[PDB]
Amino acid sequence: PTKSARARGSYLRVSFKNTRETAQAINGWKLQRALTFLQNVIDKKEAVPMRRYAGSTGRTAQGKQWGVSRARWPVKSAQFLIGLLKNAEANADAKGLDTGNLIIKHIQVNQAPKQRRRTYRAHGRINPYMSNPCHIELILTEAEETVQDVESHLSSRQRGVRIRRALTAA
Amino acid sequence: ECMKKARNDRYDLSLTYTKDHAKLPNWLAVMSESAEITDALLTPELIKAAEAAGDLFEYLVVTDQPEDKPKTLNETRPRKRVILKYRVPSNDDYTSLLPIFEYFLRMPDHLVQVAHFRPEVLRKVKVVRDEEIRKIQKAEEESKAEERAQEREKAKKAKRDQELSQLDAKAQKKYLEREREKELKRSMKKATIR
Amino acid sequence: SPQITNLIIIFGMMQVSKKIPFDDPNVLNMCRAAYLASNLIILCISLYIKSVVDKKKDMTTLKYIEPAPPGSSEEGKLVTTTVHAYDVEQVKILIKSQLFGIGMMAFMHLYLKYTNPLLIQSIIPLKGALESNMAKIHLWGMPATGDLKRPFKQPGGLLGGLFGQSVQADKKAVEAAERAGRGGVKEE
Amino acid sequence: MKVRPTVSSSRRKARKAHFSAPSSVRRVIMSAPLSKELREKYNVRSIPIRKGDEVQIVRGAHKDKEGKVTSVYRLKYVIHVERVTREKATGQTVPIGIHPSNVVITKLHLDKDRENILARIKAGREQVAKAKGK
RNA sequence: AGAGACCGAUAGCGCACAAGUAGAGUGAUCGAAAGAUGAAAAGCACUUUGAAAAGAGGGUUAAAUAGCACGUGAAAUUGUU
Ligand SMILES: [Mg+2]
Ligand SMILES: [Mg+2]
Ligand SMILES: [Mg+2]
Ligand SMILES: [Mg+2]
Ligand SMILES: [Mg+2]
Ligand SMILES: [Mg+2]
Ligand SMILES: [Mg+2]
Ligand SMILES: [Mg+2]
Ligand SMILES: [Mg+2]
Ligand SMILES: [Mg+2]
Ligand SMILES: [Mg+2]
Ligand SMILES: [Mg+2]
Ligand SMILES: [Mg+2]
Ligand SMILES: [Mg+2]
Ligand SMILES: [Mg+2]
Secondary structure: OOOEEEEEEEEEOOOHHHHHHHHHHHOOOEHHHHHHHHHHHHOOOOOEEOOOOOOOOOOOHHHHHHOOOOEEOOHHHHHHHHHHHHHHHHHHHHHOOOHHHEEEEEEEEEEOOOEOOEEEEOOOEEEEOOEOOEEEEEEEEEOOOOOOOOOOOOOHHHHHHHHHHHHHHO | OOHHHHHHHOOHHHHOEEEOOOOOOOOOOEEEOOHHHHHHHOOHHHHHHHHHHHHHEEEEEEEOOOOOOOOOOOOOOOOOEEEEEEOOOOOOOOOOOHHHHHHHHOHHHHHHHHOOOOHHHHHHHHHHHHHHHHHHHHHHHHHHHHHHHHHHHHHHHHHHHHHHHOOOHHHHHHHHHHHHHHHHHHHHHHHOOO | OHHHHHHHHHHHHHHHOOOOOOOOHHHHHHHHHHHHHHHHHHHHHHHHHHHHHHHHOOOOEEEEEEOOOOOOOOOOEEEEEEHHHHHHHHHHHHHHHHHHHHHHHHHHHHHOOOOOOHHHHOOHHHHHHHHOOHHHHHHHOOOOOHHHOOOOOOOOOHHHHHHOOOOEOOHHHHHHHHOOOOOOOOOO | OOOOOOOOOOHHHHHHHHHOOOHHHHHHHOEEEEOHHHHHHHOOOEEEOOOOOEEEEOOOOOOOOEEEEEEOOHHHOOEEEOOOEEEOOOOOEEEOOEOHHHEEEEEOOOOHHHHHHHHHHHHHHHHHHHHHHO
């Protein structure tokens, strides 16, 4: 509530599927690790595993560290997410949080209203040419995450057994 | 006669409004958070006893908030109290003040009897209490944020001086022009708001 | 206007102050006696106004908002009083205005030893006391309505019209300020 | 209950007429009652409100506020009262629109025209009372 | 001009709106979609991050998950948990 910062963006013209995969890849991570990984994705040094939206995509060796075979490098999604993470960093700094221990606690990509264009087909036909923009929303929280009734309605026979056993034992 | 001093000195009394009542004599007044509470507590016995008390009576309060204005959340905790203040007559005629003193002593019993209200009345009071608590933590946060904002402003000025000092002549010129252009752009963006 | 009337009176009074002999202790003492008589008369009418107020013993409830100190950025304050108490308080502020005037007069006449304002000072405090708001409502008996509405505005001059903001009897605001929880301030 | 064929009790027609009335009709629509003192003085119950009138607000969140009518915005069916104002975000002061039927006229702006009006109303009311009292 | 056991924004005239308009056709002709913030714009000052769009604080309001993609806000379909 007071140990968290949040950021969001709406109607961002970036691929919703790629952004969802990237957000799922960085979900639950430390902020610095997520930023480094996103820059690595932009530089094609680390890959985002394509899990749900992966139909007929390619295979790469960089998916080994995720256990998958299909992974890609959604550069545009990585840039948008880097911008949003930086905004969350600025919000945390303004609030006075320790930005060196922040954790990506919440991240969510939703579909935004679609933008319309046209494409021209054979035999004088017109088909839709749509973009799939997304809303992104994320919450960073400071990480602590250090986590460290009685029988009441017994029968008379049960209670007698308990008492006998206790008397016999001691 | 004592409404001014009661409101000014008593923090808890300042959380309530002040309304007259047709039942009471024109020299008395009721201070409450709810007309339902006023109806439940303004008994004819109390009205008659206060009439008997007369001008010796100063005030009678049922409260859970402190006399002085709290400054911390640990301070602002409920603490049930019943207070009775009155002036001392010069002739020592205490029989007139006996009804007030007796009813005051029996106040906890009557309050246990009748001072239970439907959730709508409770929600009316706890909203005010939550607003007060929020006001306290608000000022706490403004003080902390002001201190850290002063620190950040000093850091910004230091960074500007440190990086602007070692640039080239044309680099400094371009940097100043960019600062001015960005400031003007943001000012025009603020001005273009409908 | 009272300003113009006072200035017109002064135009003749400070003429007479340069023509009546002031080297004469007898004439000076006659003027002093007139000034002290005026002071005692305004004592009398202030006491009579207080007596009329006490006789009336009006217990009507009144609420208003006092402004912050002039020109300050502080919060306002809420006053819930009775009309009896407000009348008493304004009689007392008239008394304090007296005491201030008397002190200033004694300072400029006995320590600095100035003599010109004596004629004007023997009239203007008396005229203001006779023309005051309660010298209207109680001494003269006109009703306390309109400009005679209870929470009188600040008695300032032009700087009063600038910074001496009018007391607010707003029902919307009074209710807002009434339950703000601003009592119990640590005098300190 | 209406009887005359020229009068219509159509809600649609009434609303259309009210919300598309011209300025002269809106003047009569935006009438305000007189105070008790003025009513006793002039034998007139209500009059169309005018800029420069002094009014007291008797309904709404601004009850008991008094002031001079500074503008009669017929287009918005409201009036503007001196010092009955509000603050925008910028802190700029804007007047608050008050319906004239929510105020009472405590002091009238009087010139022969505003008065021929009062004399006509008074004469009509007195005649009607006399005829009914016959 | 007055009415109705009529319809209530896919209904009722094609048209509750800059509708016989926008647009199509060489032309004769064809011909839509599209109403609702709030009592009042009081339509978010100011700080901060950002190249910007915007975000985060903060403010207005009875209410902002009522913020000009504005009453309510279903299902299909989607994201997170
Ligand atoms: Mg497949
Ligand atoms: Mg295949
Ligand atoms: Mg293929
Ligand atoms: Mg073709
Ligand atoms: Mg598609
Ligand atoms: Mg239709
Ligand atoms: Mg529709
Ligand atoms: Mg149609
Ligand atoms: Mg054409
Ligand atoms: Mg709608
Ligand atoms: Mg809010
Ligand atoms: Mg809602
Ligand atoms: Mg709503
Ligand atoms: Mg909605
Ligand atoms: Mg569904």
